[PDB]
Amino acid sequence: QPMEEEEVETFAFQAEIAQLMSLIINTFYSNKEIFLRELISNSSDALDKIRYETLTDPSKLDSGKELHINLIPNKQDRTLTIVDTGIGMTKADLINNLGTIAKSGTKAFMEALQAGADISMIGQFGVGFYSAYLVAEKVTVITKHNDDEQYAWESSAGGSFTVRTDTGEPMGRGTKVILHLKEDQTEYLEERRIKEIVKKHSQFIGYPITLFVE
Numbered sequence: 001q002p003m004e005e006e007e008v009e010t011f012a013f014q015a016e017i018a019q020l021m022s023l024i025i026n027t028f029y030s031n032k033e034i035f036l037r038e039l040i041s042n043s044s045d046a047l048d049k050i051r052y053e054t055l056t057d058p059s060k061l062d063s064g065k066e067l068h069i070n071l072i073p074n075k076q077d078r079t080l081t082i083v084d085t086g087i088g089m090t091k092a093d094l095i096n097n098l099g100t101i102a103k104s105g106t107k108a109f110m111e112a113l114q115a116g117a118d119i120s121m122i123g124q125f126g127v128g129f130y131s132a133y134l135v136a137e138k139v140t141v142i143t144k145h146n147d148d149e150q151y152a153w154e155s156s157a158g159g160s161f162t163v164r165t166d167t168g169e170p171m172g173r174g175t176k177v178i179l180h181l182k183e184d185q186t187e188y189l190e191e192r193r194i195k196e197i198v199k200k201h202s203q204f205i206g207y208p209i210t211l212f213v214e
């Protein structure tokens, strides 16, 4: 019965990243499906990192040996979750990688979009994670690194994000991205569509990808 207390840290995004987010959110783009390719590619990069780091430190895998990616659509709560057993991120990694630090690609990318370039180019500018906002109104990133506790990052955009120690289900190690889909983007919860886009854009990821249906 005692009330629980939870500490939260709210951070403002870096100015151009915030501009980029408004651009992605309030502009119509037709090839939205590449958001999934970008997430799986981020997961593949993180899996590569724990993989190589373990060659020289097998203990690094005590937090989990499987190196893979799971996709979990949930039609009830309208979320598409992408989980990987990659190296994860510490709290500081989270805060720096997801918002507070300027990326040199942002401006060039925003200018390129203003010129009508395809949103698919986004990964080439180092800000592919933000493509999640093409289909999600809110994004929650839960991550666990061997050197730190499990944290949850969350943002509905609007210029800021929060970080807090995660009270949710523990992960051994890795990063889980939960996309709360916009209502007109529920196609990405359909198994056929997900298989279609993973086959089209991610046929070559070198880690198993498993789609869990129901």
Ligand SMILES: CCc1cc(-c2n[nH]c(C(=O)O)c2-c2ccc3c(c2)OCO3)c(O)cc1O
Residues within 6 Å of the ligand: 039, 041, 042, 043, 044, 045, 046, 047, 049, 084, 086, 087, 088, 089, 093, 097, 129, 141, 174, 175, 177
């Ligand atoms: C939210 C972006 C994202 C990041 C990771 C991830 N986990 N650990 C790490 C790490 O570099 O240590 C990452 C990571 C960090 C930055 C990246 C990245 C993966 O891909 C492009 O930019 C991940 O595994 C999945 C993701 O979707």
